[PDB]
Paper text:
Main protease (M pro) serves as an indispensable factor in the life cycle of severe acute respiratory syndrome coronavirus 2 (SARS-CoV-2) as well as its constantly emerging variants and is therefore considered an attractive target for antiviral drug development. SARS-CoV-2 M pro is an indispensable enzyme in viral replication and transcription, and it is extremely critical for the cleavage of two polypeptide (pp1a and pp1ab) sequences after a glutamine residue. It has a unique feature of substrate recognition that is not shared by human proteases. Moreover, M pro is highly conserved in SARS-CoV-2, which also makes it possible to develop broad-spectrum coronavirus drugs [ 17‒ 19] .
Numbering used by the authors:
A (entry chain B): 2 to 300
B (entry chain A): 3 to 300
Write the structure that this text describes.
Amino acid sequence: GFRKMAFPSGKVEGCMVQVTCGTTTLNGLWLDDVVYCPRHVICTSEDMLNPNYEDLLIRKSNHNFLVQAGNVQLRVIGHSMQNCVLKLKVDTANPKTPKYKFVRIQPGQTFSVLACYNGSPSGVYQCAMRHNFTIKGSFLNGSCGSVGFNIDYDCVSFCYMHHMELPTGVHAGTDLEGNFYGPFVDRQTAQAAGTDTTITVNVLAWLYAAVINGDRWFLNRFTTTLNDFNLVAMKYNYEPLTQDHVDILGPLSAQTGIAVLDMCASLKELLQNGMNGRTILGSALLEDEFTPFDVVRQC
Amino acid sequence: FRKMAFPSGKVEGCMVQVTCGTTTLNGLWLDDVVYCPRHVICTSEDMLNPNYEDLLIRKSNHNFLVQAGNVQLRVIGHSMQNCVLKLKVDTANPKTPKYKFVRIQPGQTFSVLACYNGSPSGVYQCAMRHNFTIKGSFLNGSCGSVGFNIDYDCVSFCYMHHMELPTGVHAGTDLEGNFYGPFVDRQTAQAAGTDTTITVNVLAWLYAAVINGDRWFLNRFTTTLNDFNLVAMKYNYEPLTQDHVDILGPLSAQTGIAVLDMCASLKELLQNGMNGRTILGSALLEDEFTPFDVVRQC
Ligand SMILES: COc1cccc2[nH]c(C(=O)N[C@@H](CC(C)C)C(=O)N[C@@H](C[C@@H]3CCNC3=O)C(=O)c3nc4ccccc4s3)cc12
Ligand SMILES: COc1cccc2[nH]c(C(=O)N[C@@H](CC(C)C)C(=O)N[C@@H](C[C@@H]3CCNC3=O)C(=O)c3nc4ccccc4s3)cc12
């Protein structure tokens, strides 16, 4: 009764285009008369290991950039670079531009990813920004420039553009100002992320989700203080729960009548005892990619 | 591997609302027809056991409020086909995609665009269980939301939502109004059949594991199809059909592991267990990725 649920992607699909420079092709986002895309579209295989991006860009001319919106070619009439993003001014404004904002999200927040190849949308799914600033996505060769977003009353808040797959199989990218999430760099190197701690407030939100959907087996008659919970949480590489997190869980607490610290005592038991093979909402593991908002929005 | 829905835009452009009285359901606007669940015509005391034919005779075109947003589409004809109502409207939808109506087989996955008051709310992947239910996420007001697959810009509509069973799973029809499974559209508690594990999808999952280099479970045995099906039934696994064997063909060729050899490997896993080992990082076998999903992702 509770599923990972993406936002409808139509407003973003109408913005996806193809950007080609030489032998490199990736995806771009076309809003008004500007196409946003990863700047390493200008790199050849020789440039990848140590690209001096300003020195490479100054050598390019507008006509070196081939931008295709479906079948139609869009004429590039100017370009600028903002951090790791290239902004191509085109001679045609996108008639399907939605109301939109660029936002930089916080670890723990979720967004929808529209995975695209050759400027054509392929799939949509939810992702969470993890505490080490990676996301557990599904991206293949040619996916760069795919974007992540949230939608609120027909306004699309773009928060992610895709750049990289780490050796561990997780993914890294930038906001739409071209600043990476995390300590990653847009060069062709094998990069490791920091320690990935679990998003505690999201696990708790999902335990409330299970209760709303009629499952209570993991509850117990005990309680805990906030600091005693956090001591155990940190022992298991969970993020410490703040009073802001407790406040954010209030509505789910009030809906279910289970105090936040009572659910923390439930999670403490699950961490110390395991699930003993049983499952929660279909999962054999503690799910941490639903926010309190995601639970309320869906329930 | 992620559960990935199809991009929903081509379907968003077809969602409308249909109101009769105070009852508002979602509808699907393709060319100059709107399709919706027929019980939009029901009142509260009509729903325990509706006489839909007698209820429809008391309706006229002007009793139906069809809206795209707040814009009314005038109804110029109406008819009933199984459990769906077809309203002819005076405007052909300019956003109509290339489309087909398909009746899917159990095990197959599709994308659901959940909608409320004609307004799309979220999208997610579902598998049709072998008892013809789906594990969806649907609230009051969701009926008429549709499920679909997209192949080369052609939208194949396969599901329209009608019901939540007492067990919390969901049931509905194809776009010709024929229920999947033994369910009926009235306000009554109905039971599904046994929910078997989707064998063909577990086999697809095993192929995905082999593709990614996780192949400890491959054995040196083979089986006949009939011997496997008789064993599978004892573990609440669905018997394989010839169609299942054939849709595993591409993965079998990709890996060089014959379908029946993979069946013998799964049979061993069912009879002896995983014994603490994992496959693609999980101790549980996934049964909601189809052979197509695995190729679409690998
Ligand atoms: C020895 O180097 C490694 C060692 C160990 C792991 C590694 N990972 C990467 C790495 O990710 N590189 C970046 C590109 C860098 C420059 C940001 C990259 O290929 N992005 C992809 C999406 C990738 C591809 C597979 N699925 C993922 O999502 C993308 O679409 C782009 N393709 C190109 C092709 C040509 C020019 C620009 C781009 S941008 C390198 C690497
Ligand atoms: C004693 O009766 C029960 C006992 C035990 C379990 C039960 N389940 C149902 C049952 O499902 N009824 C159908 C309706 C029937 C007629 C197909 C129904 O409410 N469909 C919903 C989607 C539901 C709602 C909750 N989330 C689900 O997906 C839908 O959208 C529709 N709403 C209306 C409202 C007014 C008129 C038409 C429609 S059609 C009844 C029932």
